[PDB]
Design a protein around this ligand. Structure first.
Ligand SMILES: [Zn+2]
Length: 609
DNA sequence: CGGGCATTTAAG
DNA sequence: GTTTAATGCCTTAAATGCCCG
RNA sequence: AUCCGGUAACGAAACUACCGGAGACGGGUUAGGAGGUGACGACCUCUAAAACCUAGAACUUAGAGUGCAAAUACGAGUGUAAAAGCACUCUAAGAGCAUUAAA
């Protein structure tokens, strides 16, 4: 959609007297969701043993908003049913609420207490987006990773059947593709006869029981197999990181937290004086009513209502007076053909240290209702992507690569590791975290194993949260975001200054054929006049200045520019089997020695030309 | 002897 | 510890629990 | 102790060796540049900073500007006398993020 973000620091945006509440809210929200997520996961596994294989006479357990909302209430110590009024349809809520409450009494090894989980902020609206995000994560995990569970089970089933792991991939690969497009799948859902892969999107809750069983089978059925091959998956996501997470603040959410009667009454005077209209507000109860009730008549258009929302932010924040206002005041970017004008969307995502502003197109501002000839002159380049070496660009005579170490130095990986360990060791958490919680695997789907991790953490939860709340940890998150741009931008600049001029030598490379030299003599003065051949597999930022095209990667690691076939193979017959040394298999070759970076790039460039 | 304020839930 | 794939981007009326000059 | 370029054994690999260059998150405190005598050096002075402490700022690349840091000649043997780096403003090109899972 037409929604974009501007990420900056939060200093100066919120007033000092209001910044205290925001920081407390971030900690309070994290604690509720982090503990609530564990409670929800524990309850599901209790019901998991109710039925497998799935019975045909009952429906599966499907989570909804009220499920998580009740979990949050239990964590905060609210033991009374949340049902408003009484009704036969609402009776189901009461039964579920008591069922989860009893689980809380057993998940933790001591009687619940109400005053140990005190909170004093109206986080009802803020937690709403977090609950939706958590439930969305459940759907995404189930609907987009089932095939990966199949691979793990099958590649362990082969080992259990006596096959050495050399043959496991031989059969597993075909089985996975064939079955997706043996007993790990449910009954066909779609009556239209579409392939089995389609059924995964029909309903995630049907496939969820299978994934849990796969985890239990990996832990019990395949216990004899090597633990390295049985690295556990996580069917049920939950918030684990102790670092406070970002929260979403809207016009309604901001109003609830930072508004009081003595402050709300001033809003009426300021609005009346500047606009000559008195708002229909008496107390905090009528603050967030509809526009028609507030002004007494229907708005002419959505934009009129939106302007009222912006004034709400203006009175409570320095939106129109802070440093960041420069980038939100109707900014138009120079090279947009449509000339889209952007303005603030009355929404903020922040974590106390960093703030992200939401900016939308001016054509939709308001309250939202629920619902090839250049190849002749262009200079060509070729590169083969990878992971040990991220990129390797060549012009046929010279090579440049974007090594992993380059980004590590740019992002200060070593310094960040040292600082984090030093701070943790000061509080004494190193001994407990490295020894106690290391053994207890949180990803385990066994009710016993998960309970032990949950209860062990509860004894050190308070210490852990305070230690990780230090701003140093949150500052590093901004640093990696900022420095990642610098590393890629510098490399892009280096590419231009390397191939911007003709090569000074045309004989160093023996394998350089006649075709290669033709593309090296052209001069190019602009980023957009360079075309880089790329593999099928950072590229998304490269395309912002450089033009790119796709070349097949098949057999590019063995083919040779000037040979009848794939003469290249990894070196063998030496004391040390090194990483990627390449050696030719026959004398009829231009170069008897090669490496993956040069070999792969040259073949791609040859195909490009 | 009365009236008033602030959370929170619900469907949309 | 880091990268890729996936989803998302929200408003307003009524119940009730509490409070004190 | 990592990164960049070259040398060898018909483009060597996280070590097979050698030669030339870059860099250490922010705030406190350290050694290096430069100056009364723009001799030399002694003390002082402007700037600045690795190991240690610390609830702690900041959209990114190319270039262009302004603006910094000041208190051996003569009279008869003998007395007087711009560097490292930083800040601001410009021109050109870019500019959506939160969470989970997976490898
Ligand atoms: Zn060959």
């Amino acid at each position: 959609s037409n929604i974009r973000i501007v990420k900056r620091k939060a200093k100066g945006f919120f007033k000092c007297e209001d910044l205290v509440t925001i920081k407390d809210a971030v900690k309070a929200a994290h604690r509720i969701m982090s503990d609530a997520s564990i409670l929800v996961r524990s309850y599901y596994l209790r019901w998991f043993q109710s039925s497998y294989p799935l019975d045909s006479d009952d429906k599966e357990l499907e989570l909804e908003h009220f499920h998580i909302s009740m979990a949050c209430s239990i964590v905060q110590g609210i033991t009374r049913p949340p049902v408003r009024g009484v009704g036969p349809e609402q009776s189901v809520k009461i039964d579920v609420f008591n069922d989860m409450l009893d689980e809380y009494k057993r998940l933790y090894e001591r009687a619940p207490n109400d005053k140990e989980n005190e909170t004093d902020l109206s986080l009802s609206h803020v937690l709403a987006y977090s609950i939706d995000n958590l439930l969305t994560a459940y759907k995404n995990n189930i609907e987009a990773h089932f095939s990966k569970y199949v691979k793990r089970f099958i590649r362990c089933d082969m080992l259990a059947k006596g096959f050495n792991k050399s043959e496991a991939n031989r059969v597993a690969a075909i089985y996975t593709n064939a079955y997706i497009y043996s007993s790990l799948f449910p009954s066909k859902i779609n009556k239209g006869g579409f392939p089995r892969v389609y059924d995964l999107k029909a309903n995630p809750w049907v496939y969820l029981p299978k994934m849990v069983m796969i985890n239990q089978a990996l832990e019990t059925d395949f216990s004899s197999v090597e633990h390295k091959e049985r690295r556990l998956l996580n069917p049920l996501p939950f918030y684990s990181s102790f670092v406070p997470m970002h929260i979403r603040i809207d016009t309604s959410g901001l109003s609830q937290l930072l508004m009081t009667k003595d402050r709300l009454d001033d809003f009426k005077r300021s609005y009346l004086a500047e606009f000559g209209v008195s708002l229909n507000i008496k107390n905090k109860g009528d603050m967030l009513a509809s526009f028609e009730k507030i002004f007494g008549r229907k708005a002419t258009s959505n934009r009129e209502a939106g302007l009222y929302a912006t004034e709400m932010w203006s009175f409570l924040t320095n939106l129109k007076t802070c440093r960041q206002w420069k980038e939100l005041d109707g900014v138009v970017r120079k090279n947009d053909p449509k000339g889209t004008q952007w303005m603030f969307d009355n929404a903020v995502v922040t974590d106390g240290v960093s703030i992200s502003f939401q900016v939308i197109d001016n054509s939709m501002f308001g309250r939202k209702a629920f619902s090839r000839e250049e190849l002749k002159t262009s200079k060509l380049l070729g590169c083969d992507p990878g992971k040990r070496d991220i990129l390797a660009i060549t012009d046929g005579i010279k090579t440049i690569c974007y090594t992993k170490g380059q980004r590590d130095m740019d992002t200060h990986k070593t310094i960040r590791l040292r600082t984090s360990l030093k701070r943790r060791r000061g509080c004494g958490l190193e001994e407990y975290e490295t020894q106690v919680m290391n053994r207890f695997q949180k990803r385990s789907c066994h009710p016993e194993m998960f309970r032990r991790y949950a209860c062990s953490r509860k004894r050190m939860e308070h210490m852990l949260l305070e230690c990780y709340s230090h701003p140093v940890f949150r500052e590093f998150k901004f640093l990696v975001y900022n420095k990642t741009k610098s590393s890629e931008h510098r490399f892009m600049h280096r590419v231009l200054e390397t191939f911007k001029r003709p090569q000074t030598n045309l004989s160093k490379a023996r394998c350089a054929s006649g075709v290669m030299r033709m593309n090296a003599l052209k001069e190019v003065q602009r980023h957009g006049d360079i075309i880089i051949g790329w593999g099928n597999w950072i590229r998304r930022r490269f395309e912002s200045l450089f033009k790119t095209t796709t070349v097949p990667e098949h057999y590019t690691s063995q083919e040779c520019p000037s040979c009848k076939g794939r003469c290249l193979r990894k070196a063998t017959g030496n004391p040390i089997m090194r990483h990627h040394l390449l050696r030719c298999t026959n004398d009829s070759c231009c170069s008897r020695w090669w490496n993956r970076n040069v070999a792969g790039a040259f073949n791609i460039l040859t195909r490009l030309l």
